[PDB]
Design a protein around this ligand. Sequence first.
Ligand code: IVR
Length: 161
Amino acid sequence: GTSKLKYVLQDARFFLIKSNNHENVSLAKAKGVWSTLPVNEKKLNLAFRSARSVILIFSVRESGKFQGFARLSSESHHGGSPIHWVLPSAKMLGGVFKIDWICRRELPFTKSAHLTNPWNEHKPVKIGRDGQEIELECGTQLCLLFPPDESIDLYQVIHKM
Ligand SMILES: CNc1nc(Cl)nc2c1ncn2Cc1ccccc1N
């Protein structure tokens, strides 16, 4: 069902993540981590302290789709490991956030054409730069459009909250 998902999304904040390649999204799905540029790392660290859930909604550039969404489980941390990101430098991708995936399924942009983002001039929610915040109502509805991911149990995510 969608009840636990709605509970996780309650009062959440949402950010669009735009990746240049599929490989880093695949690596993020396998290892539960994400890294971004310092402008956005600063924004996400602020958001993580400010909200019960911070949701990253991923889209690979030129794919015409979102590739899923995940909840931040930590602020960014340095050292830890050298993630083999297919770097589009490595020093700008230090700072690793831990993330718990909520949905690893794809959603085509054609399915979100009815959703506009107030924080980006009411452009369709697919439009935005890496790090663009998505207002609560639009982000909630976007996440609810994804196909359910029955391989994921939200019970442990609710306990992180
Ligand atoms: C693992 N993290 C990332 N991996 C990839 Cl392949 N692209 C990213 C990532 N974070 C942001 N972008 C998009 C981008 C690429 C290059 C210059 C500026 C911007 N915004």
